[PDB]
């Protein structure tokens, strides 16, 4: 069964395999993150609760005073979204936090409080997120882009290659906290382990080990395993473990019990090791001179005199052994320092270490961190305590601790947010293990190492920054306590929190202006994962490895949707099914696979939980129970695609669309396009502008109905019902009683957003797609937004294309467009631009908006009214006056040069203390009328229902129905009836009627007072007048047109209708494209789209033929069923026998323009099915017809490819790019022409063009470029006079920018001058 906006035009689906999981809510990261930040969360896991519980309760310097947090709440916004956009104010909600202030008595750390007080204190007005994941900051719609940064934790890298210039790889352990200082550890070409805090400068790691309260013997115990020599009767034999001899050369005769085992010089083989273990002899004779290469572990002091014979960590020799023997040290402990496995790195580090004890190490750390100050014990101790060991300045977050414990093979993922001695020592141990040869480094770009930090987490950090500033101010204030009078508001300042939140939401690197020129642009801007921003990398200093697409991007990040140029691979787009884990890592769905059955249960596997398993490919033919057809199937185990047996797999991809984003999944026949062309197609699809009339794609993907609904442009029904009234600007739904609330049933009203301005100066405009008296259900579209067709995304128009060269008018990539395309106005767009006029109170009195403009004619003031503003609807042109403002002594707002349009809406704002202008209130008196028109309709419906209830009570107990309507409707309650509880209900209903009148009056007055608010403006201004010009841009030679397969082009000629090629039926071709654009840039998707559009339009032409001459519904039903049943084995399977013989006529009437066809991304139609569908029409199976030349009437001597391609009008218009300048205004400091098109500016003859003029030898052209039509002011007017004098000759001088350079160098202590 199909939805109500589905048995109206049902798109044929050529997809072949069933979707076990439907596409989720597209803008889910934004809404979920902000809901997490803004919610009332117990236990304070995340949100405002976490910040408050992490900053409060705050206390003074043990001054028996504490400000503690009780709760918080969000007040209702003073406006709604639409009024916030209209006025120019943030859609924010006040933050009312209930704090408590407790002060203790003298000598009472735990005693009774002197005074306990609590109140609700306002601090900051945090912007709210709209229902579409956007923010309204200053009347404009912004999007906070999610960020992809390195997760907190420990990362072991190598930095192989370019160190030491010897081909020796190093290794570095970097500990990145979520907030705090870094703790890099690194090696040396001499293999010495150095620590580096905050990237400052190297110093030995044993310095920080000693700073962590460790002595030399303890460090050697930690990092090395002891080998013990025993003083005995003779030769000082050593206890030996046969395992430690793995891979060494026998320094002497390895023998035990008098039996020789290994000869001198021979390699200690594994056979020797196993036979020695079988013998199980640990005490081995060792020559005395062999120990010369060993390093003592523990310090040995004398027994009698107590003097140190040998300190810890020093070499040994015969003299040292003799000095130890005369003292009688029966135990010698040395370090097992294997040259291959267990290298002596800590020993050499201790050799380089200059510090000796803890105090020396702390002083050295203080000197490194803060150079130029005399260190002290307390200062160094406090600095090292607050470096990585205080919750106030260091924080491994939950993710930091989780990754830290996972990387060290720990078990618990929870723990302390601050570092510990054990954590640092384990990091060092893991680094040493990696250096030895065991273990492996981890790649940084792996998606198990990079988090996603969305709006709900970014906004919390800035709020926390504001909170720590506030608590610092309070701690400053709480020591100066004048108690018994201080409420918890005179110490709180709401300026830091508001400043931080406003700075984050308004002016940040990720709080971007929303891309709003079709639903796809905003729906893909909200699902944008940027690697840049605060705490991330930069375009200039990003290598190629961050650019590339990792094998873990499968299902989590799109590989073919990223902008070209400076940041490619830094601004990745989220995949369709991609989700964010509880920690922030990207996880994607996978169907669980049992022993042989692909189950329907789905698990969301992240990047690290994916290499463990072997995951079946998205298209593997299961047979009705989930058994793969072959015994082998292509899979990917650990970032490696290869074949596997059927029984080995344990997961399968949910859909074939999950590898691509939501923009790349709107390309039909994506799998036939080269990935470069696919990337360009996705981007240019984002840049398409909405046309005058939306037109559905004949060759779609089935993701159009999700994008056009989840983006929020469409007016979608909230509760199902029956349409009661459809206007061009409002829809009224009478909700079914099955879905109405018991109290205050009523209706639903949808006020459509009529012609208004988007961020890109385009027109977003909703028009109804329903008709009067028509049932709708929940969640189905009622009005189509900008560039949607019946709740289905429609970015361009389907036009009849021919792939042929046509006299060189489509030479490189150009497009030859028929004149019928511009006659039909199907690419005509509407562009709305606002112009502002502000009245400020300057000196000599303020400036007013009167129409009394001096030194202008009556034709100048003809367009303005008597109030001084232009009439709504006046077709203005370049130079006309829109607003009249006078300078006391004329700064009237006038139309800029070259911009036409029609004034569609004039908008006036006034601050308090400015009385009004008649225009200013006669505007928004319409808003009052519109509010009354809704409230009165609701009142009428509710009153009619109440009076019907009254009459229905009256039909019982002596019904008097003939006399009810004769008397007016006021007195219908006290007629002849009983005095039972029904009469009590009648009196209660009369009381409710009075209550309804009073509440309608009070709510209408509330609406009027809220609309008539002061809407306080910027300081120094009086009133703002905004005038909205709307222009129609027709297609013309010069502006870009594209397809969905990366085939862009610039229109070179608008050919007449009779000059375009035509087929044997005389039908001309709309667009002529170059065939040579296909083989080179291998985008075969456009050709197959052309063929499938030809088949679809053939089906539509058959239906239109059967509908034009009237035929019975049986024939139409049979043909439409024959069209929908066509395919190999499709999943759609529509049945027209369940249609009501009237909604099949509406279906056929919607299919007469061409039957829409869905071609899912990697599960699309095939050439056999396209040819079969062409045969279902009357079209050639080859897709090529014989076209005739339009201007000579003879054949092109080849069948040419003619079809229907979906063309998009990209937002690069030619009238927005054409610019010219002879003379205009010049800059101030350097007298050069200004820049850009707004300022009447000139093109920049750059540094590289000067070289091109020098190469030619054009010395005079270059001189006139850099002197006369530039800086040189004296020789610039003489040239103008010469040119309008009949002469062409210049008197060049010196460019005024060189004199600026001379004066700026002379403003240093440098005398630069010109000689003679």
């Amino acid at each position: 069964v199909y939805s109500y906006t589905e048995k109206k035009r049902i798109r044929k689906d050529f997809g072949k395999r069933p979707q076990v999981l439907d596409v989720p809510y597209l803008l889910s990261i934004q809404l979920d993150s902000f809901q997490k930040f803004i919610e009332q969360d117990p236990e304070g896991q995340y949100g405002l609760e976490a910040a408050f519980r992490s900053v409060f309760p705050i206390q003074s310097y043990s001054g028996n005073s504490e400000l503690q947090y009780v709760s918080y709440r969000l007040g209702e916004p003073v406006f709604d979204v639409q009024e916030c956009q209209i006025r120019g104010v943030t859609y924010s909600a006040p933050l009312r936090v209930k704090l408590r202030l407790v002060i203790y008595e003298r000598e009472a750390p735990e005693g009774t409080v002197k005074d306990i007080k609590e109140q609700e204190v306002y601090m900051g007005e945090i912007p709210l997120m709209t229902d579409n994941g956007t923010f309204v900051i200053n009347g404009t719609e912004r999007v906070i882009v999610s960020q992809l940064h390195r997760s907190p934790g420990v990362f072991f890298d190598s930095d192989k290659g370019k160190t030491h210039s010897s081909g020796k790889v190093l290794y570095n352990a970097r500990i990145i906290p979520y907030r705090g200082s870094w703790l890099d550890f690194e090696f040396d070409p001499k293999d010495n382990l150095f620590v580096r805090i905050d990237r400052r400068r190297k110093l030995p790691a044993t310095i920080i080990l000693r700073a962590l309260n460790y002595t030399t013997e303890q460090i050697l115990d930690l990092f090395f395993e002891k080998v013990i020599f025993e003083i005995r009767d003779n030769k000082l034999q050593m206890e030996l473990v046969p395992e430690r001899l793995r891979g060494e050369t026998a320094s002497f005769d390895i023998e035990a019990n008098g039996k020789v085992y290994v000869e001198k010089g021979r390699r200690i083989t594994a056979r020797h090791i196993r036979q020695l273990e079988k013998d199980d002899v640990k005490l081995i004779e060792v020559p005395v001179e062999y120990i010369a290469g060993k390093v003592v572990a523990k310090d040995y002091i004398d027994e009698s005199t107590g003097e140190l014979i040998c300190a810890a960590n020093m070499e040994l020799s015969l003299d040292l052994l003799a000095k130890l023997s005369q003292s009688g040290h029966k135990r010698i402990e040395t370090l097992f320092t294997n040259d291959l496995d267990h290298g002596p790195y800590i020993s050499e580090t201790l050799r380089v270490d200059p510090t000796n004890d803890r105090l020396s190490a702390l002083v050295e750390i203080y000197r490194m961190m803060r150079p130029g100050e005399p260190p002290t014990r307390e200062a160094a101790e406090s600095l090292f305590e607050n470096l990585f060991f205080s919750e106030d300045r260091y924080d491994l977050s939950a993710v930091g601790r989780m990754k830290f414990n996972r990387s060290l093979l720990r078990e618990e993922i929870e723990g302390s947010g601050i570092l510990s001695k054990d954590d640092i020592i384990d990091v060092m141990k893991k680094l040493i293990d990696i250096r030895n040869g065991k273990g492996e480094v981890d790649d940084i770009d792996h998606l198990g190492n990079r988090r996603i930090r969305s709006v709900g987490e970014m906004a919390e950090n800035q709020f926390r920054v504001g909170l720590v500033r506030v608590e610092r101010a309070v701690k400053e204030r709480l020591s100066l306590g004048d108690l018994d009078t201080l409420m918890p508001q005179d110490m709180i300042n709401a300026k830091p929190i508001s400043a931080a939140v406003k700075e984050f939401f308004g002016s940040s690197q990720l709080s971007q202006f929303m891309d709003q020129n079709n639903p796809l642009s905003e729906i893909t801007h909200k699902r944008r994962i940027s690697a840049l921003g605060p705490g991330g990398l930069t375009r200039e200093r990003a290598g190629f490895e961050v650019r590339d697409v990792h094998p873990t991007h499968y299902g989590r990040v799109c590989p073919i949707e990223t902008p070209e140029g400076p940041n490619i691979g830094l601004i990745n787009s989220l995949s369709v099914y991609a989700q964010t884990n509880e920690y922030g890592f990207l996880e994607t769905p996978y169907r669980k696979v049992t022993d042989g059955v692909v189950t329907d249960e789905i698990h969301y596997l992240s990047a690290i939980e994916e290499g463990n398993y072997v995951i079946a490919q998205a298209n593997s033919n299961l047979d009705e129970e989930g058994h793969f057809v072959e015994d082998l199937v292509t899979c990917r185990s650990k970032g490696e695609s290869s074949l596997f047996s059927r029984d080995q797999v344990d997961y399968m991809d949910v859909s074939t669309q999950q590898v691509v984003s939501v923009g790349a999944s709107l390309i039909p026949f994506l799998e036939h396009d080269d990935a470069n062309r696919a990337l360009m197609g996705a981007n240019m699809q984002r840049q398409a502008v909405p046309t005058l009339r939306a037109d559905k794609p004949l060759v779609g993907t089935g993701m159009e109905r999700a994008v056009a609904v989840d983006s929020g442009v469409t007016a979608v029904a909230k509760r199902g019902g029956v349409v009661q009234y459809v206007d061009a600007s409002r829809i009224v739904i009478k909700v079914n009683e099955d879905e109405m609330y018991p109290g205050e049933a009523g209706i639903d009203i949808y006020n459509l957003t009529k012609y208004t301005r988007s961020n890109q100066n385009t027109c977003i405009n909703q028009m109804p797609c329903v008709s009067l008296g028509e049932p709708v259900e929940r969640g189905d579209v009622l009005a189509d937004g900008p560039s949607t067709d019946l709740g289905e995304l429609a970015l361009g128009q389907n036009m009849r294309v021919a792939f042929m060269p046509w006299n060189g008018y489509n030479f490189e990539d150009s497009i030859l467009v028929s004149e019928r395309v511009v006659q039909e106005d199907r690419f005509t767009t509407i562009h709305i631009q606002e112009l502002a006029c502000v009245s400020r109170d300057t000196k000599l009195g303020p400036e007013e908006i009167t129409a009394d403009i001096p030194n202008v004619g009556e034709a100048a003031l003809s367009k303005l009214d008597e109030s001084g503003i232009v009439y709504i609807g006046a077709e203005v042109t370049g130079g006309d006056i829109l607003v009249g403002k006078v300078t006391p002594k004329d700064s009237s707002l006038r139309v800029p040069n070259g911009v036409s349009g029609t004034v569609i809406d004039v908008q006036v704002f006034t601050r308090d203390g400015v009385e009004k202008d008649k225009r200013a209130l006669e505007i928004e008196e319409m808003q009052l009328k519109q509010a009354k028109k809704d409230l009165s309709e609701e009142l009428q419906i509710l009153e009619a229902g109440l009076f019907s209830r009254i009459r229905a009570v009256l039909v019982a107990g002596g019904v008097e129905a003939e006399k009810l309507d004769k008397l007016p409707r006021d007195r219908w309650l006290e007629l002849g009836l009983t005095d039972e509880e029904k009469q009590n209900q009648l009196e209660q209903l009369a009381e409710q009627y009075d209550e309804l009148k009073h509440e309608f009056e009070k709510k209408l007055e509330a609406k009027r007072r809220k609309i008539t608010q002061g809407d306080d403006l910027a300081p120094g201004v009086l009133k703002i007048v905004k005038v909205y010009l709307a222009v129609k841009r027709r297609i013309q030679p010069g502006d870009k047109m594209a397809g969905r397969h990366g085939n862009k082009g610039v229109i070179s000629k608008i050919n007449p209708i009779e000059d375009m090629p035509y087929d044997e039926n005389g039908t001309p071709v709309d667009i002529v494209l170059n065939p040579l654009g296909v083989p080179s840039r291998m985008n075969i998707g456009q050709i197959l789209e052309t063929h499938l559009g030809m088949a679809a339009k053939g089906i539509g032409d058959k239906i239109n033929a059967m509908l034009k001459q009237q035929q019975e519904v049986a024939k139409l039903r049979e043909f439409i069923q024959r069209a929908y049943d066509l395919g190999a084995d499709v999943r759609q399977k529509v049945d027209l026998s369940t249609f009501s013989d009237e909604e099949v006529m509406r279906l056929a009437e919607n299919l007469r323009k061409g039957m829409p066809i869905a071609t899912p991304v990697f599960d699309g139609a095939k050439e056999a099915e396209i040819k079969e569908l062409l045969k279902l029409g009357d079209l050639p199976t080859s897709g090529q017809i014989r076209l005739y030349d339009g201007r000579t009437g003879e054949q092109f001597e080849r069948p040419v490819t003619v079809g229907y391609m979906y063309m998009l009008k990209l937002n690069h218009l030619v009238d927005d790019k054409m610019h010219a300048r002879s003379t205009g205004s010049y800059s101030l400091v350097t007298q050069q022409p200004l820049g850009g098109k707004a300022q009447f500016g000139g093109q920049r003859f750059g540094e590289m063009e000067v070289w091109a003029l020098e190469a030619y030898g054009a010395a005079y052209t270059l001189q006139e470029m850099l002197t006369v039509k530039s800086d040189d002011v004296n020789g610039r007017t003489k040239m103008y006079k010469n040119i309008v004098d009949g002469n062409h000759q210049m008197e060049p001088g010196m460019p005024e920018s060189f004199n600026v350079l001379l004066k700026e160098i002379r403003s240093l202590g440098i005398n630069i001058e010109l000689e003679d």
Binding site: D673, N676, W806, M1082, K1166, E1194, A1258, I1283
Partner: protein, 603 residues
């Protein structure tokens, strides 16, 4: 500068100067008050830091910030860097009498013509229009003429058409990599807002028509106009300055037209007919009595200048096609007929233009290039040489080759499980057998494409070079290669990981019949490697060419002969195999240093 309002916009130098004067005045007041030595010492240190921040801010440890926590611009920060006085306002600068717009084709133009919008030439040439509205007596002052061109009367459009007559304009494209990126064209006024740009100069500009824009500059003075006409005219630049190669080369539609016209199919509407000249060939083709690919015998007269610059004619009866005889009507007098008596690819007509230049000079070549362009466009439009999905012909043997390669990799896996081969040997053998399979598929596809067309020769049956559309536009050199036609009809082949290691299982499909969800993800590694490469490569090549210009910027050939007996010994470069570059290319067009001795030694 006054910002919008009563406020005044910040200036960093004013802030630094106020900061210096504050400390200077405080120091003077302290020294007048005989303040203690430590306080005035700190004041002097603060004055020193203020002056250091004024002169060169940031050369100290921490640059001071005026507002927004960003360091403010000092005196030394507006002389250096890309935003300094040198590289922003002195080496290059914004220029009056200039504009920019999108470029379209306009294939009707000649080599020396561009098409300027009628609304852009009225703004560039505005003082020139004033100087004729004030000279024809159509205006009396500057205000009258200014308003006349403001309201755009019907009399300023013929004044403009007279100003624009022989006044060249420079057309520059933004990455001016070499000097051919600025060329001067004579303007033609057009209706529209796009600058129509001749197709033959696009190769020099490196400009397609997918949305790039050009800048028009107007030479004002007479010396500037004569430099634009005698040095920068697109007529004068038909040879590259980097090497002796032509730069006016037909490309991708002119060459497809000339390839389709000059080809032979062994059958025709008229194949036995013997024509009496090129004009009869055109008369027969246009009437539909003969095919453009016939095999006729035309009686043609060709001229040769083997005399002392004098052209002698010779008439012969040559076996050619109708198309090759139609094309002979544009080839100028002096070129041999065996320059169009073949199947003209891109190289064939590039060599035809090159030999026309060296035999007949410059003016016949400039006339010839436009004729080639027009007659290529016309006969490419007439062909209707489209592209469909049936043109990419999959070999019937592709499935068998792929199955054989699957069997061989299964055999190699069986050998590896038994332990006969190591991991690296297994990987190398699999890569080699898959490369061999890819080569076999490519060869089968190319054979089945090139010799596909079998046509009855008016007798039994015969093969010929195919008229496959995609094969024609790959063979002609118009638009295509072997690798791309292989990726369309053969198999895509072995794809590499981002690090560089080849994946041991190639893409076994191609763009005609789909790609897997995984085969398409594998392709994106090398697809985005080659896009990030070109994104990061422009910023690295620009720096190199800037340093090269600034090193060598000032050599200029100043003397005429220095009289030296030194030089270099130019010898052909030999790396061990084929000669990388012969002696003729390395020694051409250079003055010898000593007399070379013939192997008639001592002569």
């Amino acid at each position: 500068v006054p910002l919008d309002g009563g406020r005044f916009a910040t200036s960093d130098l004013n802030d630094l100067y106020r900061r210096v004067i504050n400390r200077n005045n405080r120091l003077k007041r302290l020294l007048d008050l005989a303040a203690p030595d430590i306080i005035v010492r700190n004041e002097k240190r603060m004055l020193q830091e203020a002056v250091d921040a004024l002169l060169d801010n940031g050369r100290r440890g921490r640059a001071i910030t005026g507002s927004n926590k960003r360091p403010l611009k000092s005196l030394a920060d507006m002389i250096k860097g890309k935003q300094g006085r040198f590289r922003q306002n002195l080496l290059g600068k914004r220029v009056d009498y200039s504009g920019r717009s999108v470029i379209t084709v306009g294939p009707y133009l000649r080599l020396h013509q561009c098409g300027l919008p009628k609304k852009m030439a009225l703004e560039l040439f505005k003082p020139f229009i004033y100087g004729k509205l004030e000279l024809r007596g159509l205006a009396t002052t500057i205000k009258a003429a200014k308003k006349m061109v403001e309201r755009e009367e019907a009399v300023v459009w013929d004044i403009l058409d007279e100003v624009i007559r022989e006044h060249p304009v420079l057309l520059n494209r933004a990455p001016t990599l070499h000097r051919l990126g600025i060329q001067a064209f004579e303007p033609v006024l057009i209706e529209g807002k796009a600058i129509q740009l001749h197709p033959l100069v696009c190769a020099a500009y490196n400009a397609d028509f997918d949305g790039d824009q050009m800048a028009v500059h107007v030479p004002l003075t007479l010396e500037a106009q004569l430099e634009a006409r005698a040095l920068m005219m697109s007529t004068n630049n038909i040879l590259s300055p980097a090497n002796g190669e032509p730069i006016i080369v037909p490309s991708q539609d002119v060459v497809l037209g000339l390839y389709y016209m000059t080809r032979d199919c062994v059958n025709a509407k008229g194949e036995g007919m013997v024509l009496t000249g090129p004009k009869e060939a055109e008369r027969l083709y246009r009437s539909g009595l003969a095919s453009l690919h016939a095999r006729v015998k035309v009686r043609i007269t060709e001229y040769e200048k083997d005399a002392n610059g004098e052209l002698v004619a010779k008439t012969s009866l040559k076996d050619t096609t109708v198309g090759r005889a139609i094309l002979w009507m544009i080839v100028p007098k002096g070129l041999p007929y065996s320059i169009v008596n073949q199947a003209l690819g891109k190289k064939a007509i590039s060599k035809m233009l090159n030999t026309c230049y060296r035999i007949l000079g410059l003016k016949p070549t400039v006339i010839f290039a436009d004729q080639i362009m027009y007659t290529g466009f016309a006969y490419a439009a007439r062909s209707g040489a489209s592209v469909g999905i049936d043109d990419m012909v999959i070999p019937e043997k592709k499935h068998e080759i792929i199955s054989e390669a699957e069997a061989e990799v299964a055999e190699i896996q069986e050998q590896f499980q038994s332990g006969l081969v190591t991991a690296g040997e297994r990987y190398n053998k699999v890569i080699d057998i898959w490369a061999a399979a890819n080569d076999r598929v490519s060869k089968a596809m190319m054979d089945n494409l090139q010799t596909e067309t079998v046509i009855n020769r008016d007798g039994q049956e015969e093969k010929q070079v195919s008229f496959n559309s995609i094969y024609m536009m790959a063979d002609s050199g118009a638009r295509g290669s072997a690798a791309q036609i292989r990726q369309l009809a053969g198999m895509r082949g072995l794809m590499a990981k981002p690090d560089g290691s080849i994946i041991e299982t190639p893409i076994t499909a191609n763009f005609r019949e789909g790609l897997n969800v995984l085969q398409y993800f594998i392709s994106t590694h090398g697809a985005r490697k080659g896009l990030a490469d070109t994104a990061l490569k422009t910023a690295n090549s620009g720096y190199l060419t800037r340093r090269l210009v600034d090193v060598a910027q000032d050599l200029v050939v100043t003397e005429d002969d220095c009289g030296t007996h030194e030089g270099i010994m130019m010898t052909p470069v030999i790396e061990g195999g084929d000669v990388k570059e012969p002696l003729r290319d390395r020694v051409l067009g250079r003055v010898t240093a000593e007399d070379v001795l013939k192997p008639g030694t001592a002569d």
